[PDB]
Symmetry: C3
Subunit: 114 residues, 3 copies
Amino acid sequence: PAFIVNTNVPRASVPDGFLSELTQQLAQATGKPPQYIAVHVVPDQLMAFGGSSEPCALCSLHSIGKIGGAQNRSYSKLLCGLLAERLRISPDRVYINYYDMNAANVGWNNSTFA
Amino acid sequence: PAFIVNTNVPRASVPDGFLSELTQQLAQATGKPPQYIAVHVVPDQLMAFGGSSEPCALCSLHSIGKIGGAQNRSYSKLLCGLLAERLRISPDRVYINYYDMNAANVGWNNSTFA
Amino acid sequence: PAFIVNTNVPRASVPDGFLSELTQQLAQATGKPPQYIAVHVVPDQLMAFGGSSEPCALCSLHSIGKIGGAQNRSYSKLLCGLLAERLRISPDRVYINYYDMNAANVGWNNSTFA
């Protein structure tokens, strides 16, 4: 799974250990080994949410399965909670797009997961 | 909706008020309330379009509905127009990927839209 | 087609010519003229893969068709090879997501490709 967060929060406000925390919580949430979890945080962005430049985030979670109605509600509580606690972003200024990827459509290690 | 523009145009060439203009025009075009429109502009990128490093852009528009053949043509005229007027990017050096998101696959405010 | 690479490798480690090499090889691989290939490299990112911050990459390849099981295996061999040779990224620390776009969902030149 791959989790990406783009935010207008500055780099200095991203705590040491945040990528490691996301890796662990995402492994737990998705049930996938942490060795397969990729995380990417992009601070200092030029962004607005509802016209406003108050802290906000646009995110994505891509996974081969483990994506669905109940699972995605659960992920959103988890991830919005982490963004609120660690980056001081209000959950109502976060979008997370969930993508259920086909294994044939994910490249890794010179081949695909199919 | 969420609109992301990645461009090799430098930051200093992005005019003041650009994120607000995007937010407004996208609310009008999509019919969505402006409080739900998110916008993200990423200048100074290392990019090429058709092998050339002349001004170009790669963009995305994600929306829960309001995506389709005619609607996307209309969006592209609006958005290419704005990139041309405000960033001086030729419309023929812009790609815009459109995504119709299922409500269950968009997280916001600790839950999803489903 | 549009190919995006996000990496923690620093900007100074991206060799001269790399966007052109990508453009050329992708044109050959996809069969699309190079005039229609866009490439975007994003270095110096805050990323972890499998819990560690050795060189890694998260990439995407969007194309109108020319996406499928065998094709995508072939693209991954090519692209992981290039990231290994030019950026010194181990192919087991690369994910590439492949998107088969509908022509009506790709904006260009004030309209769509439909």
